Subunit: 247 residues, 4 copies
């Protein structure tokens, strides 16, 4: 069905390119504070700068490819939309693969560009001092929960009171998550974004947190928005059939 | 009437969950500047970061549950909407109870997560040096007045010139209040948000300010918007009947 | 005509109250960096905080009273709308008087609240070191020019491509002007806002700049938008009659 | 055709004036951190302030002259719209000339205003220490690519899901590019903006990067958005005829 449709592959390529741009721009803005290399200054990372960079990248790329691919740009958001029965399993898998490949390519290109930084971590997400696995896991769970909840509520298609720009809302949610989690874990929040940095830097220390926590948060957000707050008056079998049909 | 309706209880649970997420994310972003614990640095709290975190949390959760619960997320805003005769007394009481419980739960969860911080105040609102009870009370009154005025003017339902995103407007109002009041009192502005921190930290010093001042500001905003600027051409008895009817 | 209409006086009172809230909140956020008084720290004023406070105050109060008074909140913007023949002369004079009185009241209330600050200038706009009268005058002219141009283009009523929130656009224009002019002159940009601080602090040094420059910028913006970019296909006599008719 | 139309010349003058205002305000906000001159402090440039100034200037001027000139304000964006066959070659050339002249005039006026700064570079874009020609070229390419992609996707005219303010989206894209590239190259991103500073400061060191990289990024964005993601079902000859017809 969707395997032989041109629009599906265009959406996959759009997700790949937009994830590449998002990862590259956001991590490049995150690593900007270490420049100039020659100037010896005790520069402090600005959380507002990085959070706004992530949020505006999400908003801009969502405005770019919302009508083309739905503007997922996150394996956790894609998995949440799969669990809310909006996209097919094959589409979700292709989106996750494209996002991971794009993040890896973007991180490699940035590491080539930012090769002058000694000991460059390429914005790799890791636990800060004083934060163990459980606390960072909970922070990631809450951030991805609010992000997936915002995504689900924005793309409900049953609401006539919606106003403003949906890409702006998604970007502000991402920026909120970053303002929350940068000081704690660097705000992984995106399994592809952390996975690309882990692959390029050859460091997978505490990498399971940024793949499990976002998925748990997305699943909790789906459970809440679909069975507590705004239930849908449809049979479960029909929504399960969307996984094998994609419509 | 509303006691036996499923939608009312779904709205109450939505208010509870959204208040939990708001309090947790906002206070976690406020306490982020103290990390890493091992690194001994004279870190300075960024007011822009905390104000944007509060505002974007308000905007995101309002976008999430506006069609479900009305997106109050504030005992002062709920009391103002009660005094403007838009919601029933029972609904207002349930919203206040849910917001307080959610704030307490969020503060407890964050204190569990942020247990590594020595002498962690959990973002407890208190008077700064040089500010007495009256000055902080006035600052809180003005901030809650502008917030409740924005909420009332946005949800007027008689205006056809409204544009953009209403959750964005509410979030920007909250961020404005925080930019005003963080340096003075930490911008309590929300009786549930301060109440949860006071309960968890077992400190109620000058806690009456953050419960009286927001209520006074909300009442003043209701009085202004309903009897000076945009009066409603309806009898007072019919609006009083909304308290016992909820319609 | 308009002297005996209730809506005109409600609009005047709305302008007064919104200008009071704007001046109070914005200057209070500007003076926040000097707290705590007891703590001896070399605190540096954050231009982003003050600019965002001014912009969000403008946006929130415009969202509050746009349908009531038109949300001028600036003697320069009011004079520009008078010169673009949208409001009457009496309405413009009443708006200017109300804005000045509200700014004076707000500055007095804040000085009462911020009395603990030694040598508190109450956010009085003055020329910085290295900037003479001409340079600050030009900066104020450009800032008010872009602000009045944005106000005129937003409230054109002939454009069907308008989107988003107009109060948000006006607030972002104000924040842009502040990001431009805070380091130079403190971004007066509003004759009432500077006038209130000058009256309360009993200091009128270089105060003519903040009353002449904004007016010149507004007049230039009106001239441009009405005779170079988007001319109106109406006789000049009919537009002059709006000054004595108000319709 | 368009040479004898008044609206075309009004659009050209609007582009000139808006580019002048954009360059002047943005570079003035960028150079604000060096004041006061007499006060000897180790002031650090705030990237958030400069990025927000650029973005809000773009958004405000786009809101001002979108219905008049299309709000290009960038030779790279104008070239991208020419390559996407939306504007004529003569219109693109006139827009580029007007933008360059306006940027030169704005930089000269600001240098007159900011003459008190010793060794004032007038915000001239140059490679930072540790960044060679290739890395800065790639950063500029990516920033202009995302900017032109956002511009093309926003002004598609085939999308009915668009919401919010398009000038706000363009301004947020510009602010995102600045948050990315300020630490690396100062975020040239606009050939006119860098060209004016280079002409006024009489320094063209590494100036080819800020004229080649933005053009490459715009061309890549046009290629992507027009042949990979959202192809148009029209013959190439008809779109080529727009270059000589302008319709
Ligand atoms: C992503 C695309 C569209 C734009 C960026 C690609 C180009 C400009 C980038 C990507 C990889 C980069 C190279 C990566 C590594 C190095 C080694 C270093 O010692 C000198 C610079 C050099 C040789 C870089 C030059 C610029 C470069 C070729
Ligand atoms: C709110 C939900 C959905 C997510 C967060 C819940 C989980 C991940 C949090 C909440 C309470 C947390 C615990 C609170 C206290 C402590 C004691 C400390 O010495 C080690 C960590 C530990 C044991 C935390 C581990 C993580 C934890 C269990
Ligand atoms: C504007 C309205 C709605 C709210 C603010 C008004 C009230 C709370 C403010 C305005 C003026 C203020 C007073 C101004 C001056 C002083 C003197 C000082 O040594 C102690 C505090 C005291 C006595 C302030 C107390 C609080 C105060 C009374
Ligand atoms: C762009 C327009 C609308 C507003 C700005 C124009 C005016 C106010 C500006 C532009 C050029 C400026 C002059 C440029 C250079 C100098 C030399 C210096 O030693 C004293 C100030 C002085 C004499 C400036 C005074 C103010 C000035 C005349």
């Amino acid at each position: 069905s969707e395997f032989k449709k041109k629009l599906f592959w265009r959406a996959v390529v759009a997700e790949f390119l937009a994830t590449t741009l998002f990862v590259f721009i956001s991590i490049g803005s995150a690593l900007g504070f270490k420049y100039p290399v020659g100037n010896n200054q005790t520069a402090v990372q600005d959380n507002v700068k990085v959070s706004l960079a992530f949020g505006l990248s999400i908003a801009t790329l969502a405005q770019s490819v919302g009508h083309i691919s739905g503007a997922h740009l996150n394996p956790a958001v894609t998995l949440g939309l799969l669990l809310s029965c909006q996209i097919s399993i094959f589409r979700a898998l292709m989106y996750i693969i494209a996002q991971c490949v794009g993040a890896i390519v973007a991180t490699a290109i940035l590491s080539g560009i930012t090769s002058s930084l000694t000991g460059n971590s390429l914005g790799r997400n890791d636990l800060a001092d004083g934060v163990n696995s459980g606390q960072g896991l909970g922070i990631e769970i809450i951030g991805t929960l609010q992000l997936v909840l915002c995504v689900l509520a924005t793309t409900d298609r049953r609401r006539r009171d919606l106003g403003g720009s949906a890409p702006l809302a998604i970007g502000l949610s991402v920026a909120l998550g970053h303002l929350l989690a940068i000081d704690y874990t660097g705000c992984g929040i995106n399994p592809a974004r952390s996975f690309g940095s882990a692959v390029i830097t050859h460091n997978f220390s505490n990498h399971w947190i940024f793949w499990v926590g976002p998925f748990i948060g997305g699943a909790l957000a789906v459970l809440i928005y679909d069975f507590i707050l705004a239930p849908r008056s449809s049979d479960l079998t029909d929504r399960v059939k969307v996984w094998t049909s994609g419509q």
